[PDB]
Every structure is written in C-alpha cells, then in structure tokens.
Amino acid sequence: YLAVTPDYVPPLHNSHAFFRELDIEVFSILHCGLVTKFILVVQLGPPELLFLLEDLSQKLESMLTGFSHLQQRSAQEIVHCVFQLLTPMCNHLENIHNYFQC
C-alpha cells in the first residue's frame, strides 16, 4: 500500500522519523541462536535478526561516530551495554559464516 501512494505523512528516508523509537533493552532477545530454513524454541529467524541488526547499526552510527531517547543516555553506558551483547553476537557471526561456507 505504500507503493501506489505518491506521498503520505501520517503521525526509507522516513523509516526512523515516522516510527516509534526502540530502547536499548530490546536487543537482549539476541541470546537465542538463529535457525535457517533451507539447510535445516521459537527459533529467531534470519529476517527479524536482520531487522534487529539494522536498528542497532542505525543507533551506533548516530551515537558513537532525530533520535531522542538514545541521546539522553551516557556514551560510556552505551558502549558498555553494547559490549555486554558481544558474546551472543559472535556466535551468530560464526553460524552465518558456516552457513555461507556450506
């Protein structure tokens, strides 16, 4: 329904401005490992994981190197909390590495 309308502004350039902000706490769901379909719990899939990584990347490139809730937090706090999520992230990286080498 977006494509047919030329423009519409109800309260990819408007992806983050129009949508409601997401807090840092949501990324805790990353602890569940991904399950791919073709190669073969609720099994967090590829596309939602891409969505999470997209939002986290758009947070980081704004903070470290619009947003309201993210910018009223300490930079040291943000770095520490991102570090906190390092160990369930490298497992995803290793798993997709094995996906591609497969």
What does this structure look like?
Helix content is 46%, strand content 0%. It has four helices and no strands. The radius of gyration is 16 Å and the shape is flat. The N and C termini lie far apart (38 Å). Belongs to the Fanconi anemia protein FANCD2 family.
What order do the helices and strands come in, and which of them pair?
Blueprint: H1 15-18, H2 46-63, H3 75-84, H4 87-101
Subcellular location: Nucleus
Organism: Homo sapiens (Human)
Protein name: Fanconi anemia group D2 protein
Please summarize what this structure is.
This protein is mainly α. The chain is built from 4 helices and no strands. The longest helix has 18 residues, at 46-63.
Short key terms for the protein model shown above:
1 chains, about 100 residues, mainly alpha, about 45% helix, Fanconi anemia group D2 protein
